[PDB]
Amino acid sequence: TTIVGVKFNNGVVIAADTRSTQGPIVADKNCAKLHRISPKIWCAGAGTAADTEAVTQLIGSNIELHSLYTSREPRVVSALQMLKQHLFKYQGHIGAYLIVAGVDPTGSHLFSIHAHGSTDVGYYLSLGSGSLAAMAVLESHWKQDLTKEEAIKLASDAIQAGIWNDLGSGSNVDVCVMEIGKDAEYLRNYLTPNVREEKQKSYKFPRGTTAVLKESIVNICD
């Protein structure tokens, strides 16, 4: 898995590849790893996927509830503090490793969270088996004050680094752009550089190929 987060002048971008692995096997060739904590706070996760899904949604729900209670837009610091305190309690047993990014009334934010509950702040970050490919890109080319356009390129290229070089990652690039002015833009499958080539043959079967013992109609109605 490759996930990055990149700060630019008026906001923050996150991106991620879309390969989901079980051991050496690609279980899903295009799962969405970009998760929404609230409209403008989004999240990418590596590690145990039941956990990143679960922790993202619990905190998301509590965030929604907090927001309603306080009549304020959710803050990235609140997502962070709740996530971290929850993970800390479970001592790294919840296998969640997250980049969490967003904009809220106080500005634009980028943080990472580790299973055990430690957090980091940065202008650029990566997590997952592609961390090091991705980081070779951000270390080479990150600079103070990128435009939105330069940031998408950078994020996107960092995921590509991992797609091509990390066996743990591949398929497509998902991006989400959170700009201080605006609505968050989720750009699912922003890049799809891995279309499977056409097969050499068709495997459609002559009907009646399969030996059948017994047929019967199943009862769905009442």
Partner: protein, 196 residues
Amino acid sequence: TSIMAVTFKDGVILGADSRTTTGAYIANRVTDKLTRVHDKIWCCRSGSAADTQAIADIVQYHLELYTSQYGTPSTETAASVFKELCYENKDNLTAGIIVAGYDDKNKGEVYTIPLGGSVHKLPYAIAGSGSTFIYGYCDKNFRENMSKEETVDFIKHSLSQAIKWDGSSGGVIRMVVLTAAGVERLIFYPDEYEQL
């Protein structure tokens, strides 16, 4: 990690490197290891990042509540809260914490709270894995009652040796100066401090 706090004539300075590693990998080359638990009480963290963050957050909560009820806490009080958490949860934490603070009655104070949760008040304190390399240097060069600039220099030289020999240390050198004047944040970059 290489962290230290040094009392001087007008108060206390905390300093630290900025490298956090997982094995050979530098997970973060610009960490802030100088953490605020009150306006003029700060700490340096070493050990598990998860534990020292959880601790500093709980300490900052306790001292904000203290302040509301009883006004400004002594540095010694901060040390004592830190210590209660560290000692009472010794089996489950790996936190090596230095606490540094400025008080008008007491001026600069420094308390070191090593692994098991014991407390020790000292004129200065070093800690973290980089520290082992500067016991000699530090013991030779520290004097009581230095000026701001002398103290800054002593930290700068000390940490840069620690950084030079300890693979777990590196990046920038951060300092927080605590006096009656207020709170000053310093940063020194490799290109300056490798030259020493």
